[PDB]
């Protein structure tokens, strides 16, 4: 039986090979053994054992019933791995940490926390005689009759949803109880019993009972429901909230404007109008969410994101699995701190500047110590936890930490080791750099040879940027020689540009270094030729990807690549100290920004924020004294904003009334940024442009459950090759009333046969992150689902696939598990 696999497993006696055999022996009915071995990137060394163990495991599971199918997996679960540190109980944060002075008698008053827990309170007293430890005191908080209600996170109006909960009885003897539901106006209880009577039940001693209720929502997001438990000991009240959302897919449309009456920065802008547009597929009985924010500076939005909100809100909506997202947490805080410190703008605060400076420094340290989880043994940074080290993310995090070292000191040895690893271990003979992992950071235009050449050029220039940023920590000779070699590579093999993105990144990477070489001037002129300009004199000026797209086509829609190239050109112009050419670019970038201050993706966001901050810091800012008033087109007016340098971080006001919006200004200096976001709900995707072939359905198995199978594939454009896509993300919304089985995803992620890089379950969404989605065939995720409670008329959920670094290339489809016909408030008006 299990001895056959154990022979190989305990005979190879290799740390890496043992795990390969272990996850080769895992059950997998959907794909064959060779297909599983195809994805392994560790090399043949354990590919042989993986194939052998998979074959043996498949053979041994033929004649055995459902008794040894668990014995084998539970015997294989041990002695192959050592352990995984994991606790299943959660303990609340301790209280009463104060330090007092006792003059032989003191009394404090407080309240115990709401938790059925045996609190142990202890005290240590120190004085001139010495130290004494007082006797511990035990105080247990215990409620003998309890009611715990299981409330689903979100529901969609139009469903018959039953919510089920538990009545717990800790009394010794038997007891009969009454349970009561309070009905809110916007929810039909399907009986309208409102007292609403009762159905008395009975529970035994030290037992529990299960009680279910059936309801249906009418309004949206009704967070006020009461449950009453009335027993021999009286009546207890329990308050619960329910979040109801409409049908469709959330869609956000953003629009910005920059206002400057004096026209110092190129143009005069006193009035801007955003129309109240109602799209075709607006969900009935759903108001369109509109929010307006006004800030008194270009970096005013970043200041609002960092300072106005105590916690650092994430600028984007991307998943946090990758190390890049965890690193993104520090960038806005750093740029705010850099602007404040270098501009010496500590006088904006009314409180003590030193305390806020120390708090911001501690937040920087927080981010700095949060990124540390991804360091490997050789001080090289891995993209995912336990994955292979990548030079791309190593250079990126090296640049960011070299920035952070300006205000918060870094470990010199760590940066030295990382910077000497990325130079010695991975670098060509001619000066180029090789990637180690398969973390594709960008999909590049052209055919396969052109794709490889542009990938090499982009990676080399990116690494040069990082090294030139983090040189100050560890200035050495070998790394300087490698940097010079890479600079020579860029200089000699950049000019025959294939894509303007690589040309722009190479130009920026060269600008930080030697700017006297004539080839750099030729590169700069070639970049300057490709500029697209709107307005005469130039008011908008930007770049894009120009291989065969040199026809004048401005869709006016910002894309991650477009913003990235524009930001790199902006940084090159700033570093060359050219101000007359730069005003339209900063105007466009300031108009491009979103609510929180973060652009479409991460790598464009960091570069754009750096460009705006450096432009504000270099071009000296003007005194802020300005009057801005926003009013609806036909409806009444709205709050009027009078901003000085003492007040520009005003609270963001949501647009309540429905009308076209007009923002007007008087005579005043400075710059103002006005950004309007529009969150709306849609019922279809036919209008959108899809770029991924998708198909998701539900199957049934044989204890038997339901299974969900989704499949996605890439559709390359005419310019792109057929190698696939870059790092991609698949999002599956789940229908209300069911949950996703975590064991299947843990199997699909935590093995050497990883079909995906990371998985997570947040807010009723299953999010998976993968290195590449093939274009030739379909790649499919498959997992069981569990029915949490019975629901009826359930609304369909969504299935989205999008590239990580350019979310524009996305495709969404509506799907549902099953829909079969089922009088109690069923018709929702």
């Amino acid at each position, epitope marked *: 039986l299990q001895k056959k696999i154990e022979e190989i497993a305990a005979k190879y006696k290799h740390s890496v090979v043992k795990k390969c055999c272990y996850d080769g022996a895992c059950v997998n009915n959907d794909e064959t053994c060779e297909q599983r071995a195809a994805r392994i990137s560790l090399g043949p060394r354990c590919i042989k054992a993986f194939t052998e163990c998979c074959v043996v495991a498949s053979q041994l599971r033929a004649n055995i019933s459902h008794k040894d199918m668990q014995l084998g997996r539970l015997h294989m679960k041990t002695l192959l791995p050592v352990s995984k540190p994991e606790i299943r109980s959660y303990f609340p944060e301790s209280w009463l940490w104060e330090v007092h002075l006792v003059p032989r008698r003191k009394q404090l008053q407080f309240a115990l926390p709401d938790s059925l827990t045996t609190w142990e309170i202890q005290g240590v007293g120190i004085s001139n005689t010495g130290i004494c430890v007082a006797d511990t005191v035990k105080a247990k908080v215990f409620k003998d009759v309890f009611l715990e209600m299981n409330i689903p996170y979100s529901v969609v109006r139009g469903e018959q949803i039953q919510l089920k909960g538990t009545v717990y009885n800790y009394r010794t003897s038997g007891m009969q109880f009454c349970v009561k539901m309070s009905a809110v106006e916007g929810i039909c209880t399907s009986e309208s019993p409102v007292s609403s009577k009762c159905v008395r039940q009975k529970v035994e001693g030290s037992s529990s009972h299960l009680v279910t209720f059936t309801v249906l929502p009418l309004e949206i997001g009704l967070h006020n429901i009461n449950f009453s438990l009335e027993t021999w000991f009286g009546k207890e009240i329990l308050v619960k909230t329910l979040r109801v959302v409409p049908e469709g897919v959330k869609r956000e449309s953003y629009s910005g404007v920059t206002l400057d009456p004096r026209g110092i920065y190129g143009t005069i802008s006193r009035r801007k109008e955003f129309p109240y547009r109602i799209p075709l597929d607006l969900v009935p009985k759903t108001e369109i969410k509109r929010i307006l924010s006004v800030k008194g500076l270009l970096v005013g939005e970043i200041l609002s994101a960092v300072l106005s909100q105590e916690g650092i809100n994430i600028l984007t909506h991307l998943p946090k699995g990758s190390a890049e997202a965890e690193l993104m947490s520090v960038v806005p805080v750093f740029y705010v701190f850099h602007y404040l*410190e*270098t501009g010496n703008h500590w006088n904006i605060f009314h409180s003590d500047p030193l305390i806020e400076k120390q708090k911001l420094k501690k937040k920087l340290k927080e981010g700095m110590l949060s990124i540390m989880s991804y360091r490997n043994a050789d001080y090289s940074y891995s993209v995912w936890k336990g994955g292979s080290a990548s030079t791309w993310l190593t250079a990126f995090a090296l640049r960011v930490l070299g920035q952070v*070292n*300006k205000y918060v*000191e870094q470990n*010199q040895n760590s940066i030295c080791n990382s910077l000497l690893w990325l130079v010695e271990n991975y670098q060509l003979d001619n000066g180029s750099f090789k990637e180690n992992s398969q973390y594709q950071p960008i999909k590049l235009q052209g055919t396969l040879p052109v794709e490889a050449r542009e990938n090499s050029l982009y990676l080399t220039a990116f690494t040069v940027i990082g090294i*030139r940023k983090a*040189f*100050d*920590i*560890c*200035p*050495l*000779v070998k790394i*300087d020689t490698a*940097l010079i070699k890479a600079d020579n590579f860029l200089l000699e093999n950049t000019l025959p540009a294939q894509s303007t993105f690589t040309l722009a990144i190479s130009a920026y990477a060269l600008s*930080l*270094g*030697d700017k006297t070489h004539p080839q750099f001037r030729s590169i700069v002129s070639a970049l300057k030729r490709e500029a697209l300009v709107k307005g005469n004199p130039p008011i908008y000026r930007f770049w894009k990807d120009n291989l065969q797209h040199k026809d004048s086509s401005v869709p006016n829609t910002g894309t991650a690549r477009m913003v990235e190239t524009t930001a790199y050109a902006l940084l090159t112009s700033l570093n060359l100290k050219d101000i007359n050419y730069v005003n339209p670019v900063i105007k466009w970038l300031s108009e491009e920004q979103r609510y929180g201050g973060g652009f479409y993706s991460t790598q464009d966001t960091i570069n754009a924020i750096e460009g705006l901050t450096e432009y504000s810091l270099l071009v000296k800012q003007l005194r802020l004294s300005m009057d801005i008033d926003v009013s609806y087109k036909h409806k009444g007016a709205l709050h009027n904003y009078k901003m000085t340098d003492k007040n520009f971080l005003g609270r963001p006001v949501e647009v309540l009334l429905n009308d076209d919006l007009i923002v007007s200004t008087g005579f005043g200096s400075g710059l103002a940024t006005v950004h309007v976001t529009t969150v709306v709900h849609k019922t279809s995707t036919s209008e959108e442009v899809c770029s991924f072939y998708l198909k998701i359905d539900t199957q049934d198995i044989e204890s038997d459950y339901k299974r969900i199978v989704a499949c996605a594939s890439y559709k390359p454009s005419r310019e792109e090759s057929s190698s696939g896509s870059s790092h991609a993300v698949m999002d599956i919304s789940l229908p209300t009333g069911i949950s996703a089985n975590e064991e299947d995803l843990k199997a699909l992620v935590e093995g050497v046969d990883q079909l995906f890089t990371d998985y997570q379950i947040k807010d009723g969404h299953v999010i998976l992150q993968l290195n590449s989605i093939p274009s030739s065939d379909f790649l499919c995720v498959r997992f069981r689902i569990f029915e949490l409670f019975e629901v009826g008329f359930l609304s369909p959920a969504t299935f989205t696939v999008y590239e990580y670094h350019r979310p524009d290339k996305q495709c969404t489809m509506f799907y549902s598990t099953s829909n079969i016909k089922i009088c109690k408030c069923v018709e929702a008006d």
Partner: nanobody
Amino acid sequence: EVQLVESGGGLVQPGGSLRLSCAASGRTFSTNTMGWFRQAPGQEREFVALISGNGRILDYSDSAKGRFTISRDNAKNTVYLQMNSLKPEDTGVYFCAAEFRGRTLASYWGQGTQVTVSS
């Protein structure tokens, strides 16, 4: 206005002695690498030596092998270069630099001070 006004230097005999203390005149400079250049008349700035923001990393140009051994103090944000050995070929407005961003160029620059080796 972050400035690096120079201090130290003057007139000296072949085989004399001298010492400069590049003193900061603005925002703090604790962790930023600082070093020294050479400004031989007719030509322009040329690297001489550098020391990091911690002091554990040093670099000396081949010409000036370390006859002006470099140090720095963080309490006053000052950089000490002690030119004892001098000859009538070290003439030029010596330069101390801000955070380096590589080896040459550097970010912030000072006006320099004139040192003349009069025979």
